[model samples]
Target: SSLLEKGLDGAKKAVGGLGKLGKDAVEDLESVGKGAVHDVKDVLDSVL
Candidate 1:
């Protein structure tokens, strides 16, 4: 159980990082393309 909790914590942290990057991607979408932003957000949302 301890090991499982630790692994879960690590997963949460990793997902949080991905979420941060997802936010940045959305914010910078104006420069790249709104569609790309949507795709990124969808992928991140489906996972992280």
Candidate 2:
């Protein structure tokens, strides 16, 4: 009667909004974060 009386559909719709650009951004940020972690590990290695 009211979208099955649940908001799961709406929730999924919102998340799907990030399909193409979202994937790219996620991957780009994933690499960026990986680089930062790599640098931190290098510093730790130098300390020990």
Candidate 3:
């Protein structure tokens, strides 16, 4: 039972880390998208 408890705890910690990583990845993607949109606007403005 103690070993099972330890295993569960480890799993929980790993899941927590993964959740944080997922959030950071989403934020990074949003930033990249925002930059890309701005760059596109600049290109369009130069063409127009």
Best lDDT goes to which candidate?
3
- Estimate the TM-score of every prediction: 0.31, 0.42, 0.37
lDDT for 45 in candidate 3 is 96
Runs of candidate 3 with Cα error greater than 4 angstroms are 1-21, 33-35
- Every candidate's lDDT: 0.73, 0.71, 0.78
What lDDT score is found at residue 4 in candidate 2? 50
- Residue lDDT tens for model 1, 1-48: 698898879767875777576767646655577577677888998796
**Model 3 C-alpha RMSD to native:** 9.3
- lDDT tens per residue, model 2, 1-48: 577555766656654676444767767777797889897998999899
TM-score of 2: 0.42
By TM-score, the better pick of 1 and 2 is 2
Q: Which residues of candidate 2, in runs, are more than 4 Å off?
A: 1-12, 33-35
Tell how far residue 36 is off in model 3, in angstroms. 3.2
Worst 10 residues of 2 by lDDT: 12-21
By lDDT, the candidates rank as: 3, 1, 2
Provide the global lDDT of candidate 2 against the true structure. 0.71
Of the two candidates 1 and 3, the one with more favorable TM-score, higher being better, is 3
